[PDB]
Design an enzyme around this catalytic site. Structure first.
Site, PDB file in Angstrom:
ATOM      1  N   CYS A  28      39.708 -40.939 -38.593  1.00 40.41           N
ATOM      2  CA  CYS A  28      38.311 -41.975 -38.658  1.00 40.41           C
ATOM      3  C   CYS A  28      37.497 -41.370 -37.304  1.00 40.41           C
ATOM      4  O   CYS A  28      37.535 -41.411 -36.212  1.00 40.41           O
ATOM      5  CB  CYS A  28      38.774 -43.279 -38.342  1.00 40.41           C
ATOM      6  SG  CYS A  28      37.294 -44.450 -38.534  1.00 40.41           S
ATOM      7  N   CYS A  31      35.799 -44.109 -34.780  1.00 45.64           N
ATOM      8  CA  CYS A  31      36.824 -44.402 -34.005  1.00 45.64           C
ATOM      9  C   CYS A  31      36.773 -43.352 -33.043  1.00 45.64           C
ATOM     10  O   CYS A  31      36.770 -43.972 -31.641  1.00 45.64           O
ATOM     11  CB  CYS A  31      38.128 -44.216 -34.561  1.00 45.64           C
ATOM     12  SG  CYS A  31      38.825 -45.561 -35.694  1.00 45.64           S
TER      13      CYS A  31
END
Ligand SMILES: [Cl-]
Ligand SMILES: [Cl-]
Ligand SMILES: [Cl-]
Ligand SMILES: [Cl-]
Ligand SMILES: [Cl-]
Ligand SMILES: [Cl-]
Length: 103
Positions: A28, A31
């Site tokens: 991600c 993230c």
């Protein structure tokens, strides 16, 4: 910034006053963006806050538990109990705001 898992998630939570849990995954991108931000957070509140990271790919039952369906999801726990939720990849000040509300 420590890792939490399906096994020790509840120990860590009842062991510390304020815990900021980062639900994330290796694949991600947003993230990766808040990751250096969350450790500046860790440093800033070094004595009144514990920052923990929950890999949702390795801990699906924990992600299912709080129904974390889209990540960069950050949840704040105040006494083993969840009090704040941040759902996007956000500026540091947005995390700072919700942490100090419970400090
Ligand atoms: Cl405690
Ligand atoms: Cl699990
Ligand atoms: Cl995002
Ligand atoms: Cl900014
Ligand atoms: Cl700053
Ligand atoms: Cl900021």
């Amino acid at each position: 910034p420590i890792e939490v898992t399906d096994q020790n998630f509840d120990e860590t939570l009842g062991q510390h006053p304020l815990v900021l849990v980062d639900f994330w995954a290796e694949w991600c991108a947003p993230c990766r963006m808040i990751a250096p931000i969350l450790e500046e957070i860790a440093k800033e509140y070094e004595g009144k806050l514990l920052v923990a990271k929950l890999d949702v790919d390795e801990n699906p039952k924990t992600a299912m538990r709080y129904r974390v369906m889209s990540i960069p999801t950050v949840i704040l726990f105040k006494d083993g109990q969840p009090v704040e939720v941040l759902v996007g990849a956000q500026p540091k000040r947005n995390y700072q705001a919700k942490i100090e509300k419970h400090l």
